[PDB]
Every structure is written in C-alpha cells, then in structure tokens.
C-alpha cells in the first residue's frame, strides 16, 4: 500500500502549487535560489 502525503503549499494566485512527499517525511519550505 502506498504511503504518501499531499501538502498543499501556499502560493500566489494563478497556480496551485502542491507537493506530494512520502508520509514518513516532514514537509519543509523551498529555499530561495
């Protein structure tokens, strides 16, 4: 059975940026370039 989690990252309006990552991990923000 798959174990994934779809965290809906907040974003400016226009696009729906959301990241699916393995459940055992914890989402962290994306570092600026």
């Amino acid at each position: 059975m798959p174990r994934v989690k779809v965290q809906s990252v907040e974003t400016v309006e226009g696009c729906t940026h959301e990241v699916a990552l393995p459940a055992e991990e914890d989402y962290l923000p994306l570092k600026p370039r």
Partner: protein, 826 residues
C-alpha cells in the same frame, strides 16, 4: 517534434545532441534529445551514457495514455535510478496529484505539482450551424457560456434539418474578409483536407513578394532531392498552393513537404493550413484562428465525438502572443449534433490521465534475462496497480457507510415482512416470465395493429399508454413504433438521445417513439380509431384526448389481452407458469399480514433494505477482488507461452532463443525468432526477405489485396503457417487470442511494392503501383529499415553470418534518395 526541439536547443546552447531511430547527431553531448523508445532501449541495455545523467525532462507526458505506446513510457520511468530528478511537462489534466503521488511512491522523493489554467490571450468560441447564415458567439473571452446564443444556433440547426458552394469556403472567405487570415483548419480526414484545399484554388492570400520568397524557399528546400524526385507530381503540384498562400499538412504527405510547409507557416508565408490533429502538437506554430470542419474522428476503436481534451488541445493553438489581442475558434456543427453534446464539448474539462500498461513479450523476455529482477516488479509498480491502491480506501469507506446505514434501519417483525417480500418478488418474476412468453413474435405481432393500445415501460421509466403505429423486422429484433408522451427535452436533442417519458408536472409532445417489442409491458385490447395522418401536431393531440376518454370510460383500468385464450397460446410452459403464479398468489393472500394496514410503507422500507444489502454485497465483492495484482494471470499465461516454445526455461531462465528474441523490439518477436530458427530465411534472396519483413511492419486499413505472383506467395504462406502454429500454442495456454485476427494482423499489401522498390525501381513508379498515400509508404519503409537493422543484430547474436549478409544487402538496397531524405531541421 524531437527534430524541432533539437533545432531549438541547438540554436540555444549548441552543446546539444540527438538520438532517434532515423539519425544520431553529436551523441557525446551533454543535452541529448531522444524519443522515449530510444531511452527505453538504453535503459534495457544499460548504456554508460545513462550513468552520467542527472535530469530527465519528459515532454507531453499526457501522451502516456496512447493505449499502444503508453507502456513504453512507464517502463522508462520505472527503470531509471532514484538519484535522477524528473521534470514532467504536460497539458492541463485533473488527476495530476495522482501522478505526483505515483512518482513519490516509486522513487521516494518529493514531487511537486504546478497546475495553472492561465492562458496569455483570451479565446472566443463561435458555432457555425449547418445551413445557417452566421457565426454565433457561444463562448465569450470571459469564459461565461452564453446559453441564449447556443439555443438559437441549435434551433437554426434543427430548422434546417427538418426543412460559396461549400460551407468551409464561406467560412474561410469570411475569415479573410474580416482580417482573421492566419487560420488552421482541423479536419479529421486526409481526403477532407485535400478536398477543402483544392476547393480554395481561386483565392490568393499572398502578395507578389511573398510569392517570390515562397518559390525561392521551396526550390532551395527541394534542391536536396535528385532530379527524378523533383519531377514527382507530389512536389510539383503543391507549389501553386503555397504560392497562393494555402497549405496542406497531414500524415499522408511526404515528410519533406510536411517540414517545408511547417517552416513556411512558422514564417508566416502560409495563411490557411488544412491539417489533421497531428499538427496540433507542433511546436511554436500558433495562428489567429482555428476552424473545426467536423467534430467526429475515428480513433483506434471506431468513430466518436472528439473529447473535450482534444478540443482544448487544438483550440489552444489560437491566438498568438502579443501581435493579436484576441483568439478565435470556430466549430462547425452538422445535423447529427445534439445540444447536450455541444454543451459537453464546449464546457467539459480535460480528460484524466489513465494508464495503458499492458504486457509485451519483449518486456517479459528482457526482465527475465536480467537478473535480480522479475516481471512481477514491473507489474507491481506500473501506475496501474497504483491507481487501484489509491481507489481501495474509497470502496472501503463506501462499504462501511453502507453497512452502518443498513444496520441503522429498524424492522419490528422481520421474518413475516421478509416472507411477504419474497413472495411478492416471486410473483413479479413469474409475471416477467409470462410477459416473456407473450412477446414471442409469432403470437403478439398479429395484435400490434396501427391502433392497438399498449403500455411501454422500459425498466425504470414508464411512458404510459400509447397507440401502436407500425412495426418492422429491423436488420431478428422487432422494432414497434408507438405514439407516446415525450419530455420536450429528449425531444429537442433527439439527434442523439433515445427518448424519455414526459415529466409528471409538464405536458409532452406526443411523438412517435421506436421502442423494442419486448418493452411492451401490457398489450391492452382497445383499438382506437387512428387519424390515418399523424404528421400534423394537432392529430397527435386528438389521439391523446381519445386515450384519456377511453381511460375515463373504464374506471378501473383498461382490459388486457389474456395470454391463454385471447392470444391462443397452447404450449404447456405457459400453463405451468400460470399454475405457479396462482399458487403464489393464494399463498400471499392467505398471509396474516396482508389484510393489516400501513404495510405499504413497511414493504417499501424492506425493499430499500434489500437494495442496500445487495449494494453492500457487490461493493465488498469488488473490494475483495481489487486487493490482488491484476495482470498476474496474464503474466503467467505469457510465461507459459514463452517456455512452451523453448524461449523460457522451466526454471524461468532465458534460453538462447529468448536471448535472440530480446533484440527485436520494433515488430513481433515470437514470429521473427521462430522463423529465423526454422530456417525459413536461409533460402530466400534479400528481396523476398525484405518484402516479408515489410509485410511485418505494415498496419493500415486498405483492401487493395494485390496478387503476389511467385516469390511473394510461398514465403507469405509459410509465414501464415508459422503464425497459425503460434496462435494455436498461445490459445492452448489459456491466453485470450482470436486466431483469425492474429493471422490477419500481418497485412502483406505492400509486399510487392517493397519488392519492386528493392529491385531498384524509381519511387514514382512504385507510388503509382498501389493506392496508399506516399507518406504511408515512406513511413513503412523507414520502419522496415530499422527492423532490418535489428534483424542484423539478432543474426549476429545467433552467429549465422548468412542472415547478417542477407539483411545487410536488404538494408543497402532500400536505403536511397527519397525515402530516407534527411530532414531539413537538422
């Protein structure tokens, strides 16, 4: 598309390669552009070039649902190592989250999803009805569907149906005169594109300077070909069209003409391009207007309405960036178009991305060959078990909710109510048996006179009493036309809908409906007096008044024909059914609960309880079913077939035969390997072998069936025998395969053409030797060449130098000027 993308990247970075079946440019580069199939080959054979990769950029990933070529995607994703990172471009699709979850679960790394419907320039959608006199703005730039205009357009369509030689010519002329000149006309047929292009050979969108430039460009592009090729009618007769500013782009054309027309259109020298759907996927070829001739296409299966996904994909090619501030898409609708279909097409969103994974002997053999991995792995991770795993929680919750709801209901005395319910159900079943007895066409047809009064009730919906009008032997189903009350909704979109009973509140139109004979619930016996002319909408209301009067005369229901004596049915089966129903009726009437009141609501609640019970039964059945891998039985059957022919050892280790079969991937494997090992090829000269292999790599619906004289018939029948043996062995292994279809897949139509071409004949000669479009001949020739290279590789693998030499000569003979003309994008 790969060639065009390679040209762009090379113009950008200049450190770019290219690797397709046709060619390979600068293989030792850092940015390789290669089709999925080449990548799959590299993965299966493990080339060192794959080791250094860090990014893989799949393009048009929504193409993964190509039914046949979808699988070659998933394999590539599964076999890639986990250290790589992907970038999946695609078109807008609803179930992107599922794909991202699949990638995460498969490679154990974060996968993002950036969904956005934003487009640079707005779109206006017009509809042109067939027979109308203008374009109706069905959808505005704001995206708000306009219902009134759509209804008006469909009303015009209906009025024309029940009532500038061609519509397309009027549309394109209007486009020209309204300054919408750069136009792409999507017609889902090669012949339609040809005809519409020819019809327009009386306009001119090009200034003289454009004519000179187009002539110069076309001559420069064609100078590569030999002098004889320049004399071909195909190249010569397109030049006037491009000169006047009209172009054609469909798979039938020659590749070089397609590339030249793409260049010209991208440079703005062509202002009306008649193309099929392929040109939609082109890169950087927008237009200010898109025109759909016919909204019907023949996919692999059969005709169908173009899905909203295809409509969106094609309409996206309308409206250039900045130069034009508005995009226009015009859809032409014919008579067989229902308003519901139009609304779904215009308002529907993109289709979901559903896998198309299906086993191939090549996959099984390759996975068996390599060690520390087996096909079960691929089956487990191939985005087809994944969808079912994602679905399982839904059905689990559904069964739990249905169970709790089922237990929630309360029945005070369930035993008696259940017995009564079962008796009632048995009575209903016996009544159904009786009705099935009545509707025998030899007994009821004499009673279906043009005035008879019959009630027609398709399960779920009952139209009420209606007057029969006519019946016929459709073609042995019998279609009886009754005169029922229709809903005025299914009556306006009747072009596609079947029929629907009038809603209880409103009043119907009292129209003639062609129902099936076995939908007549009761054939009453009161034959009305029919007006004898039921065209005008006033008589068909006098009929309704007459029916109502007849009902008002019989206060307790209209009489029904007695199946036994009135219809004179003699066979004893009806007698026994009557006895059974009589006994059940008596047992019901004797029941203590029958006389008591308020049993109707109890009966309804018990009925719904049983309904919920059966729903739970089915839901948990399918939930149990889905908890197992799906194609596993298919894999076992394939392994049986492979081992029974000697490819696979009993312990499932690839034998030399299977090792050879691994190489061949552009065509069938079992047939080629078996024929190679049966010594079939070891006598044929290079020409016959090339022709036979061409018979392998051709698949097109053509019925020319040219006669094969001597050297092409014997080999063909030997191939037929080998295919028959393979089909029989496969069937014996409990593998679903239709032997006739399998033997008919290998169409030898081009065998003689390819033989003559190998002999050395000029291309013009062979192009006139058959009927298939020259483009198809070129495509089949290229595919045959690549198959021959693979066959040379396999012959080298078995160490039979004679086959190597024969296939090398075959390659040499059929690889020359025009068919393998290097693309000008390189």
């Amino acid at each position: 598309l790969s060639n065009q993308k390679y040209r762009e990247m090379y113009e950008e970075f200049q450190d770019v390669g290219l690797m397709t079946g046709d060619v390979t440019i600068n293989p030792t580069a850092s940015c390789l552009v290669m089709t999925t199939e080449i990548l799959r080959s590299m993965l299966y054979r493990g080339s060192e070039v794959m080791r250094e990769v860090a990014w893989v950029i799949f393009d048009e990933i929504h193409y993964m649902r190509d039914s046949e070529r979808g699988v070659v995607w998933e394999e590539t994703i599964i076999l890639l190592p986990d250290n790589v990172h992907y970038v999946f471009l695609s078109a807008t699709i609803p179930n992107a989250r599922q794909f991202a979850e699949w990638i995460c679960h498969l490679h154990k790394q974060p996968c993002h999803v950036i969904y956005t419907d934003y487009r640079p320039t707005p779109l206006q959608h017009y509809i042109f009805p067939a027979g109308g006199d203008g374009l109706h703005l069905v959808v505005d730039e704001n995206g708000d569907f306009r219902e009134d205009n759509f209804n008006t357009a469909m009303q015009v369509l209906r009025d024309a149906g029940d009532l500038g030689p061609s519509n397309v010519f009027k549309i394109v002329k209007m486009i020209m005169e309204r300054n919408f000149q750069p136009v792409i006309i999507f017609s889902f047929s090669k012949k339609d594109c040809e005809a519409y292009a020819l019809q327009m050979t009386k306009l001119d969108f090009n200034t003289d300077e454009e004519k000179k430039m187009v002539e110069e460009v076309f001559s420069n592009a064609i100078d590569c070909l030999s002098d004889e090729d320049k004399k071909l009618p195909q190249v010569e007769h397109v030049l006037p069209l491009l000169k006047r500013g009209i172009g054609i782009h469909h798979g039938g054309l020659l590749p070089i003409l397609k590339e030249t027309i793409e260049i010209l259109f991208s440079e703005g020298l062509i202002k009306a391009l008649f193309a099929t759907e392929t040109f939609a996927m082109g890169i950087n070829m927008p237009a200010r207007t898109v025109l759909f001739t016919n909204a019907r296409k023949f996919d692999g299966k059969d005709f169908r309405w173009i899905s909203s996904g295809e409509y969106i994909q094609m309409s996206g090619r309308a409206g250039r960036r900045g130069m034009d501030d508005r995009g226009i898409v015009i859809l032409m609708v014919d008579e067989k178009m229902s308003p519901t279909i139009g609304k779904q097409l215009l308002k529907g969103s993109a289709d979901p991305l559903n896998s198309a994974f299906h086993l191939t002997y090549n996959m099984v053999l390759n996975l068996l060959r390599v060690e520390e991995i087996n096909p079960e792995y691929m089956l487990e991770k191939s985005f087809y078990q994944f969808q079912h795993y994602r679905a399982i929680p839904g059905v689990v919750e559904k069964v739990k909710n249905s169970e709790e709801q089922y237990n929630k209901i309360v029945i005070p005395n369930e035993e008696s109510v259940v017995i009564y319910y079962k008796i009632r159900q048995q009575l209903a079943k016996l009544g159904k048996e009786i009705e099935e007895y009545i509707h025998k066409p030899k007994y009821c047809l004499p009673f279906l006179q043009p005035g008879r009064l019959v009630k027609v009730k398709n399960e779920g919906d009952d139209f009420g009493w209606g007057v029969v009008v006519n019946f016929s032997k459709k073609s042995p189903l019998y279609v009886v036309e009754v005169l029922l009350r229709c809903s005025k909704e299914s009556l306006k979109n009747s072009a596609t809908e079947a029929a629907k009973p009038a809603k209880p509140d409103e009043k119907g139109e009292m129209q003639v409906v062609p129902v099936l004979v076995h939908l007549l619930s009761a054939i009453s016996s009161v034959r009305l007096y029919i007006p004898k002319d039921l065209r005008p909408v006033d008589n068909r209301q006098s009929v309704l008044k007459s029916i109502q009067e007849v009902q008002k005369r019989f206060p307790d229901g209209i009489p029904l024909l007695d199946p036994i004596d009135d219809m004179g049915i003699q066979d004893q089966g009806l007698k026994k059914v009557i006895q059974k129903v009589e006994a059940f009726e008596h047992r019901m009437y004797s029941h203590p609960l029958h006389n008591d009141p308020n049993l109707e609501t109890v009966y309804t609640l018990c009925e719904k309880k049983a309904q919920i019970a059966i729903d739970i039964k089915s839901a948990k059945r399918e939930l149990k079913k889905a908890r197992t891998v799906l194609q596993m039985d298919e894999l076992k059957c394939r392994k049986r077939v492979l081992r029974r022919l000697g490819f696979a050892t009993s312990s499932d280790v690839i034998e030399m035969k299977g090792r050879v079969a691994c190489e061949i991937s552009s065509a069938d494997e079992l047939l080629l390997t078996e024929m190679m090992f049966n010594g079939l090829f070891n006598d044929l000269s290079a020409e016959q072998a090339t022709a036979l292999l061409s018979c392998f790599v051709f698949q097109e619906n053509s019925s020319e069936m040219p006669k094969l004289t001597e050297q092409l018939a014997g080999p063909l029948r030997q191939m037929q025998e080998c295919a028959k043996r393979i089909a029989k062995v496969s069937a014996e292994a409990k593998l679903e395969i239709d032997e006739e279809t399998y033997l008919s897949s290998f169409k030898p139509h081009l065998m003689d053409v390819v033989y003559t071409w190998a002999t050395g004949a000029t291309f013009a000669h062979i192009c006139k030797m058959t009927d298939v479009f020259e483009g198809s001949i070129i495509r089949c020739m290229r595919r045959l060449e690549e198959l021959l290279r693979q066959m040379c590789q396999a012959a080298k693998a078995i160490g039979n130098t004679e086959l190597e030499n024969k296939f090398a000569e075959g390659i040499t003979k059929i690889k020359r000027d025009i068919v393998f003309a290097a693309s000008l994008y390189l």
